[PDB]
Design a protein around this ligand. Structure first.
Ligand SMILES: [Mg+2]
Ligand SMILES: [Mg+2]
Ligand SMILES: [Zn+2]
Ligand SMILES: [Zn+2]
Lengths: 926, 72, 132, 125
RNA sequence: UAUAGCUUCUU
RNA sequence: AAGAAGCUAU
């Protein structure tokens, strides 16, 4: 009636309009962070216990302000008033009103919260950490209501996309000040609770978007002066949103005011430690864990990750010219130098070298290599650069001219094309077509390719979940051994590779491996465990067949980096490639029955199994720095008895300064790499696998923790979810007895086959449909909120029939064929790829088939499994290659019999145009 | 009839490149764009129009004797 | 024995490869024109014949309907064959003449050009036109 | 043959040592010992970021302009200010390395140049 | 850069 | 098993 609306509207001059129906309660669907001894998770639940009224400003226009009235009991109605009376004076506490009303014959207590927002902070966090492009109405409403955009901004399809439409970042950055004010009010509420004693747990859903706190139903009194808030779940779940919305942008202005000019720092300032401490004490004051601005002071890698996560956020408010090598003037025999004696990482702090020699008598070979390898001397004597073609930071130009490197087209092998056409190939309407060519590039291709690092953005992670994820991921690499080897035990192949800049001006890796002794190499390696050695990476365009224009570049890191990384990682990398039957299948061959073995190992003993595979858009450019640091730390846990804490930290710093934020040379100019992976490193394919497994485990954690715990029939999975939430957000230490259990649960219901950024999963269909294991949507949301990319579901496949094998893995398809008596799985390529490799070549001497007959033998080895395809047009490629090999030999014999007067008495070359030499390559026992 | 066009376009761009056409940045950019468009095409009409546009580049120069090479 | 046979095979391979890259330009041009002849396209054949006898373009032939095209005419016979009044036929399209200038850069009007009066101007004209 | 291979390696070690040591000494002579010294003498400790060495001590600047719109707002005229300093133009070349003139850089004649343009200026005192 | 496979020669 | 060379695919 019009009496409840008159009592709820107390003396406040408010005009209310009912949202429900009279005194009937209003049911809503909102996100909650629940842990109450029976359910645990960050999921969406039905909330029907309060009546909600809206307030109109004036005339007949509704505003964003609600009067939520709750009705629970009588005992709680006194507890929540006793706590409110103590917290009423705080400015971050939503105004409460208490009154008694009669529904029919009873006096029902009511609690009214005045001028609340429609949504809370939990809704904002859930909408962005569980993004679905088809159902994102809550995010749209939040964006529109707070003047981030207009309702028409969503008519532009692909608005959510990060790679396409990068204006979504600017749209999201319109909530930064709201989030910052929410954090400030959270700190105020924490201080108020600490005063007089209100010990309790702070939750995201108990704070509206204005930053006001309104729920005190689980608090308890204590002696005034000693009250402890619990802010683990709150901050940890809110962490990923603080960099997406750029909350701390206002910290770079004069008085923290967005209307004033940016603060101007001394160009020579690089420490920034007091500022970091002040920021931490201002925004995260009750976070109960020591924070080290410089990670050189950390206790272990589990602390390094924790502190680097905070540094990632805090370093976005400092000038970009204060990061990089720190140089100083030394004197070599009296002539001044300029060398790097430190480094300022955005994640690791202000690492300082320990072996700086200010005065030197001579210059040895090791010192010569170290000095003519860092960018200090090259940049100090270069010219200022203002490259306007890219948004990346530019350091200096090392010449007086800009180099514009192009790529030439392919070389047509006309004889093979005519031979194929004469045998009914490339006819109109055929299923075999030319799709792979040699594409050409102009002079702007190099810089256009380099400017794709704009997809790398500062990403903050959920540390309390990332730590558990790393502990679970480390179990996938237990069946390996690693450590440090000596210069003798380094097995380096292809000694004629590039040596990087500037070492490519005098020789290849051979010239530097032959020049240095074993003692010199050991001394250089031991130097890198006490000092940081910045290096320079050179970018070049590559000449290879492809199906898209998509100019491709190859990075060559300097010899001073690879030579020392080998002695650190070779044992582990060679042990990973010698293991069969493991999750990581690097080093496992597909010949002699390897493909069948791998497929039957991934299948394992899953129940109701399906097959799934996903994609990583812009994997090498968009990968956050935190995940790369995590992978590097995980690969370095093998050095538990050969290195100390300081040695391991300095090796990690060298890795970060050499392959993560190195200075890249492109067209005779020096730039700054923001992040991502470089193809020139030997550990790229092994860190990619760690990153892939970490993402796959995060997907499963998110799938299991975002499920309604009251609808889980199985009593084991429910307790698994409960204890997973506990181990994440309520237990600050490693629980091996649960890490083992979660690893076993994932291995029984989620089997993976990982090769760098390529994976195939055989999972339990029923569990995935019940939300107990990961699906494609979970991967989409995880990539959206932890990788700054949108993963289209059109690039992911699924296969319900396990007898048809994965749709695609390593650019190969699977067919269950009959060999001998049993059935085996065989991989076959795209016929267009083989035909294009045969028709277009990258050298004028490879177009004369007589001098190159092993090219076609190797191409026919790969094309054999096409002979068992149901399609007869696919199966003709093998026979065409055999016929071409036969004709090539026939022509070569005559050519050699005419150019000379001799012929080979015995050749033993008839094995190559018969279908046994190639059929024996896919049969086991060899 | 499209594979023939793509192969002839590849050979034409090779001839242009070995004729020192990349010394001019804009002409090389146009030739590269046409050659890459031909390869990715799907209908013969646009491929042939691009092919004639790209052959006009070689016809406009004077470094390749046309009558002599048209001796059948 | 086999030492000698394998030595000869290596010697033959080196001789061939060193000769394959010593004749790249002529072979590439021959292959290109063989494939162009085999393609048998009216649009390409027209421009090829014109370039063979009298007509060579001065810039990339546009594909749009507004871009300007400039051509070179060596004498009057090519003008008769390709030019018929105010319309220009080139590369299997219709072009409307807009401005003609003789070889000395002096503008010339269409009506002036005829047979007898041909030997009165710098013949290598430059005709410009636009697509229909 | 082991001795001969070792002699080759021992010869190349000294050959590359001279190249590395000759490069380092050549760069010593391109360093402004009186301008780069000023900033180092001001640092509280002696260490400065490497990114501000060319910014505050370089004597020549090179600008790469993608189009005319960027040229208008960056290097218009003869003297322009960048990095809180005044630079005076010295030469302008295009992507083909030919010399371009400031008069030819117009909004109507713009579509006639190899547009990647490198503008080199000298710091003005 | 790393992985796998094929062919040839020497010990 | 050691190597020296060539090639193919991921
Ligand atoms: Mg609540
Ligand atoms: Mg694939
Ligand atoms: Zn720490
Ligand atoms: Zn170690």
């Amino acid at each position: 009636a019009q009496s409840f609306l008159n009592r709820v509207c107390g003396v406040s001059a408010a005009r209310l309009t009912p949202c429900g129906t009279g005194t009937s309660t209003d049911v809503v669907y909102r996100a909650f962070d629940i842990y109450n001894d029976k359910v645990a998770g960050f999921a969406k639940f039905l909330k029907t216990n309060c009546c909600r009224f809206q307030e109109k400003d004036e005339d007949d226009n509704l505003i964003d302000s609600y009067f939520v009235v709750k009705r629970h009991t009588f005992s709680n109605y006194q507890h929540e008033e006793t706590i409110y009376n103590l917290l009423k004076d705080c400015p971050a506490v939503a105004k409460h009103d208490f009154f008694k009303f009669r529904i029919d014959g009873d006096m029902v207590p009511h609690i009214s919260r005045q001028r609340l927002t429609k949504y809370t902070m939990a809704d904002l966090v859930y909408a962005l950490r569980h993004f679905d492009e088809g159902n994102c109405d809550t995010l749209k409403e939040i964006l529109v209501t707070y003047n981030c955009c207009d309702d028409d901004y969503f008519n532009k399809k692909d608005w959510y996309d990060f790679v396409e439409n990068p204006d979504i970042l600017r749209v999201y950055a319109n909530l930064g000040e709201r989030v910052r004010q929410a954090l400030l009010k959270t700190v105020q509420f924490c201080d108020a609770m600490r005063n007089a004693g209100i010990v309790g747990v702070l939750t995201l859903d108990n704070q509206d978007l204005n930053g006001n706190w309104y729920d005190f139903g689980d608090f308890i009194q204590t002696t005034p002066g000693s009250g402890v808030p619990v802010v683990d779940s709150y901050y940890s779940l809110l962490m990923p949103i603080l960099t997406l919305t750029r909350a701390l942008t206002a910290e770079s202005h004069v008085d923290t005011d967005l209307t004033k000019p940016y603060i101007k720092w001394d160009l020579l300032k690089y420490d920034f430690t007091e500022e970091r401490l002040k920021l931490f004490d201002r925004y995260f004051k009750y976070w109960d864990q020591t924070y080290h601005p410089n990670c050189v002071n950390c206790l272990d890698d589990r602390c390094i990750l924790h502190c680097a996560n905070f540094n990632v956020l805090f370093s976005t408010v400092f000038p970009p010219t204060s990061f990089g090598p720190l140089v100083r003037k030394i004197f070599v025999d009296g002539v001044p130098f300029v060398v790097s004696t430190g480094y300022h990482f955005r994640e690791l702090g202000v690492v300082h070298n320990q072996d700086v020699n200010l005065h030197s008598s001579r210059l040895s070979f090791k010192e010569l290599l170290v000095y003519a390898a860092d960018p200090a001397m090259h940049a100090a004597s270069g010219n200022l650069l203002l490259d306007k073609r890219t948004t990346c930071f530019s350091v200096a130009a090392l010449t007086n001219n800009v180099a514009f490197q192009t790529v030439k087209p392919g070389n047509f092998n006309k004889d093979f094309y005519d031979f194929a056409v004469s045998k009914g190939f490339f006819k109109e309407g055929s299923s075999v077509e030319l799709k792979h060519f040699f594409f050409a590039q102009d002079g702007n291709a190099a810089i256009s390719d380099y400017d794709y690092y704009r997809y790398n953005l500062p990403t903050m992670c959920d540390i309390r979940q990332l730590l558990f994820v790393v502990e679970v991921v480390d179990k996938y690499f237990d069946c390996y051994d690693g450590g440090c080897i000596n210069a003798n035990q380094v097995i380096v192949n292809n000694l004629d590779k590039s040596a990087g800049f500037p070492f490519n001006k005098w020789g290849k890796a051979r010239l530097y491996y032959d020049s240095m002794s074993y003692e010199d190499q050991d001394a250089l390696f031991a130097y890198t465990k006490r000092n940081v050695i910045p290096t320079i990476t050179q970018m070049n365009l590559k000449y290879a067949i492809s199906a898209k224009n998509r100019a491709r570049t190859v990075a060559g890191v300097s010899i001073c980096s690879t030579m020392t990384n080998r002695q650190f990682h070779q044992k582990l990398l060679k042990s990973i490639a010698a293991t069969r039957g493991a999750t990581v299948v690097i080093g496992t061959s597909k010949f002699y029955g390897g493909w069948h073995n791998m497929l039957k190992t991934v299948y394992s003993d899953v129940e109701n199994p399906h097959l799934m595979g996903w994609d990583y858009p812009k994997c090498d450019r968009a990968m956050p720095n935190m995940l790369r640091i995590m992978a590097s730390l995980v690969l370095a846990r093998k050095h538990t008895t050969c290195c100390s804490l300081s040695h391991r930290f300095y090796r990690l710093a060298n890795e970060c300064a050499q392959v993560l934020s190195e200075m890249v040379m492109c067209g005779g100019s020096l730039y700054v790499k923001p992040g991502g992976t470089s193809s020139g490193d030997a550990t790229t394919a092994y860190a990619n696998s760690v990153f892939n497994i970490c993402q796959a485990v995060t997907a499963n954690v998110n799938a299991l923790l975002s499920t309604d715990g009251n609808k889980i029939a199985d009593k084991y999975v429910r307790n698994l979810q409960h204890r997973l939430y506990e181990c994440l957000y309520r237990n600050r230490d490693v629980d091996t007895d649960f890490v083992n259990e979660f690893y076993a649960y994932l291995r029984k219901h989620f089997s993976m086959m990982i090769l760098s950024d390529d994976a195939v999963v055989c999972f339990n269909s029923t569990y995935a449909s019940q939300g107990l294991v990961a699906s494609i949507k979970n991967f989409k949301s995880v990539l959206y909120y932890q990788n700054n990319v949108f993963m289209s579901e059109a690039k992911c496949w699924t296969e319900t029939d396990l007898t048809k094998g994965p749709h695609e893995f390593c650019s190969q398809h699977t067919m269950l064929v009959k060999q001998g008596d049993d059935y085996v799985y065989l991989p076959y390529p795209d016929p267009s790829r083989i035909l294009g490799a045969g028709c277009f070549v990258d050298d004028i001497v490879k177009t004369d088939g007589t001098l190159m007959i092993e090219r076609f033998v190797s191409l026919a080895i790969d094309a054999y499994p096409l002979t068992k395809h149901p399609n007869q047009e696919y199966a003709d490629v093998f026979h065409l290659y055999l016929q071409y090999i036969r004709k090539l030999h026939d022509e070569l014999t005559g050519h050699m019999l005419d150019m000379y007067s001799v012929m080979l008495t015995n050749d033993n070359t008839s094995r190559y145009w018969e279908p046994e030499f190639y059929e024996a390559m896919y049969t086991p026992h060899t | 009839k499209m594979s023939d066009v793509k192969c002839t376009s590849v050979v034409l761009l090779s001839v242009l490149q070995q004729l020192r056409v990349e010394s001019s940045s804009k002409l090389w950019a146009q030739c590269v764009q046409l050659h890459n468009d031909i390869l990715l095409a799907k209908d013969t009409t646009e491929a042939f129009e691009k092919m004639v546009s790209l052959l006009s580049v070689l016809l406009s120069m004077q470094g390749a004797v046309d009558i002599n090479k048209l001796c059948e | 024995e086999k030492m000698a046979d394998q030595a000869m095979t290596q010697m033959y391979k080196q001789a061939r490869s060193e000769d394959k890259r010593a004749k790249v330009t002529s072979a590439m041009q021959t292959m290109l024109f063989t494939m162009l002849r085999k393609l048998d396209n009216d649009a390409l054949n027209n421009i090829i014949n014109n370039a063979r006898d009298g007509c060579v373009p001065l810039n990339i032939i546009p594909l749009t309907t507004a871009a300007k095209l400039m051509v070179v005419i060596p004498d009057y016979n090519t003008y008769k064959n390709t030019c018929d009044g105010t319309t220009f036929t080139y590369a299997s399209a219709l072009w409307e003449i807009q401005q003609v200038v003789d070889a000395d850069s002096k503008i010339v009007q269409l009506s002036e050009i005829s047979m007898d009066n041909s030997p009165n101007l710098a013949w290598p004209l430059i005709v410009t036109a636009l697509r229909a």
